[PDB]
Design a protein around this ligand. Structure first.
Ligand SMILES: CN1CCN(C(=O)c2ccc3c(c2)[nH]c2c(C(N)=O)ccc(-c4ccccc4Cl)c23)CC1
Length: 265
């Protein structure tokens, strides 16, 4: 209503119910908007974000609606700290979810997680919107086990100069020259498929970031997780061509994943 723009949520409409944990920006809480709608309330610590630039981008991010993207509902910008209000994902981070051995996942479930992320990425690619930090830690899981991509493009507003740079999810042209493109998101997606089929292992787990950078620069790569079929491995490996222009698009990766779901059903 009055005094609130389309991207602005009145904080008085929030009911705080439980603490979910602490992220890089601060505390995340589960709550309700206008007494009945589930939301996650992200409290942004002062000095951690380029707030004015983020607020302007929030307007664009609210227009990015896809069932496999963690929806941005709005921002509470009139106070310190500011809040980012998003879709609630009851099962938390994909990385922690993969690491919980109790789930005893079938490979069909792992491929479905890949397809969830790929559909979100295909959507972002259709809108010429880069994620810029795609990785399992940036995906969330809802109460139905659906995986959704979160914090798309948010790395552009991080003030900590340490960003902790995602060396292990970066292609040679990013490490060598800072060349970000649709093709650096493609590379990151391949690493994410590897994280999923490896049940949340750290990519290049025996190497430091410096060693990872040198390994990649020499044209060497991650290798096949035990749970990946030959066809699944061919798809993740296709994301890692040295030449960015030889890497597929998300539309092609989606077509590949759907083909493997059919063949290996
Ligand atoms: C063992 N446990 C059982 C119940 N679990 C949780 O209670 C739970 C835990 C975290 C998160 C979570 C749920 N939901 C969100 C959301 C969201 N938009 O809903 C965003 C960020 C995080 C988030 C991500 C990284 C670090 C800290 C955090 Cl907070 C979480 C899930 C796992």
């Amino acid at each position: 209503g009055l005094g609130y723009g389309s991207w602005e949520i009145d904080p008085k409409d929030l009911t705080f119910l439980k603490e979910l944990g602490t992220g890089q920006f601060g505390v995340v809480k589960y709550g309700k908007w206008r007494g009945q709608y589930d939301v996650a309330i992200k409290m942004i610590k002062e000095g951690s974000m380029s707030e004015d630039e983020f607020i302007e981008e929030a307007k664009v991010m609210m227009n990015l609606s896809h069932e496999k993207l963690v929806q941005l509902y709005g921002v509470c910008t009139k106070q310190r700290p500011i809040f980012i209000i998003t879709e609630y994902m009851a099962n938390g981070c994909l990385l922690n979810y993969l690491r919980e051995m109790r789930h005893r996942f079938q490979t069909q479930q792992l491929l479905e997680m890949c397809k969830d992320v790929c559909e979100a990425m295909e959507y972002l690619e259709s809108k010429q919107f880069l994620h810029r930090d795609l990785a399992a830690r940036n995906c969330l899981v809802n109460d139905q086990g659906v995986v959704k991509v979160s914090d798309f493009g948010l790395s552009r507003y991080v003030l900590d100069d340490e960003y902790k740079f995602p060396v292990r999810w970066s292609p040679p042209e990013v490490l060598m020259y800072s060349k970000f493109s649709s093709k650096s998101d493609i590379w990151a997606f391949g690493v994410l498929m590897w994280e999923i089929y490896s049940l949340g292992k750290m990519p290049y787990e025996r190497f430091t970031n410096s060693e990872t950078a040198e390994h990649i620069a020499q044209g060497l790569r991650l290798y096949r997780p035990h749970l990946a079929s030959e066809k699944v491995y061919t798809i993740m490996y296709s994301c890692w061509h040295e030449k960015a222009d030889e890497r597929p698009t998300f539309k092609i990766l989606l077509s590949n994943i759907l083909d493997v779901m059919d063949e290996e059903s």
